[PDB]
């Protein structure tokens, strides 16, 4: 299937170049697959969602996203328009309030929540978690990704906005899940992407497209908007059968666009993640 005018992060996804505007995917589009974003919330009523979308937890008084950034990951994760696998399922995880912020106990008990909860829903092949937020260094933090991951969960996290090593930042540091870089439509890394060994693979980040609340779209970068590409990727690679939870950022790196990206420091990865999708 082709989807012409795409956001630029959609093209870059199927292509072996940047500069192009068509988005290429196969049409089972994450059909069957579940997408958890853990996050603001979501607007589930907003078009583009096709009523694929709800809230199934919420820590605060409303599980509505009063923010937009919930809204706009999981656009890119799943919208019509703006999203990596139109088909899949996009269960919202209200963790975060809506000034964007989260006690990282709250964090942690929705990070268990997915576990058990993907019990209760339909999802024949197979669940991704999506993560697009962090802060400092946490063993407990990092813990609960592992668990999340270990349960049979693709788990993605955002790899943090500060310019530096993603060590000292949780659960982008978690070993075992998958830690997503920002890239920009030149191919650069995008100027506030962490980097480091712990990175395992870069997604589309800087002015990317998506949902927003009130019915409306905006675009804004950030980790954050990298690591929605990568879970519905997974979602949709998942659907076609190419990889599973435990395996899929492993492949998402083996199938990679490599060594495109420009100012990757020495020792991280230069892996830009990419759909290998052959019309």
Same mark, same amino acid.
């Given at each position: 299937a082709a989807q012409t005018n795409a956001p630029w992060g959609l093209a870059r996804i199927s292509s072996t170049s940047p500069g192009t505007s068509t988005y290429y995917?196969?049409?089972?589009?994450?059909?069957?697959?579940?997408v958890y974003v853990i996050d603001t919330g979501i607007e589930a009523?907003?078009?583009?969602?096709?009523?694929?979308?709800?809230?199934?937890?919420?820590?605060?008084?409303?599980?509505?996203?009063?923010?937009?950034?919930?809204?706009?990951?999981?656009?890119?994760?799943?919208?019509?328009?703006?999203?990596?696998?139109?088909?899949?399922?996009?269960?919202?995880?209200?963790?975060?309030?809506?000034?964007?912020?989260?006690?990282?106990?709250?964090?942690?008990?929705?990070?268990?929540?997915?576990?058990?909860? /993907?019990?209760?829903?339909?999802?024949?092949?197979?669940?991704?978690?999506?993560?697009?937020?962090?802060?400092?260094?946490?063993?407990?933090?990092n813990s609960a990704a592992a668990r999340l991951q270990s349960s049979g969960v693709m788990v993605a996290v955002a790899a943090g906005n500060n310019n530096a090593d993603a060590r000292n930042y949780s659960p982008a540091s978690e070993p075992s899940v998958c830690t997503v870089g920002a890239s920009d439509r030149y191919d650069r890394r995008s100027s506030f992407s962490n980097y480091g060994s712990v990175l395992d693979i870069f997604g589309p980040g800087t002015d990317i497209?998506?949902?927003?609340?009130?019915?409306?779209?905006?675009?804004?970068?950030?980790?954050?908007?990298?690591?929605?590409?990568?879970?519905?990727?997974?979602?949709?690679?998942?659907?076609?059968? /190419?990889?599973?939870?435990?395996?899929?950022?492993?492949?998402?790196?083996?199938?990679?666009?490599?060594?495109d990206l420009s100012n990757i420091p020495f020792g991280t990865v230069n892996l830009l993640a990419y759909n290998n999708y052959q019309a």
């Open positions: 995917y196969d049409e089972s589009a994450g059909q069957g697959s579940c009523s907003h078009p583009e969602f096709e009523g694929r979308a709800q809230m199934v937890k919420t820590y605060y008084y409303s599980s509505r996203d009063g923010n937009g950034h919930g809204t706009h990951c999981a656009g890119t994760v799943g919208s019509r328009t703006y999203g990596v696998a139109k088909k899949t399922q996009l269960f919202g995880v209200k963790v975060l309030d809506d000034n964007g912020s989260g006690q990282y106990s709250t964090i942690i008990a929705g990070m268990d929540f997915v576990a058990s909860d /993907k019990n209760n829903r339909n999802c024949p092949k197979g669940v991704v978690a999506s993560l697009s937020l962090g802060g400092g260094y946490s063993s407990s933090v497209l998506s949902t927003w609340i009130g019915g409306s779209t905006r675009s804004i970068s950030g980790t954050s908007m990298a690591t929605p590409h990568v879970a519905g990727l997974a979602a949709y690679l998942m659907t076609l059968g /190419k990889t599973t939870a435990a395996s899929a950022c492993r492949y998402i790196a083996d199938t990679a666009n490599k060594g």
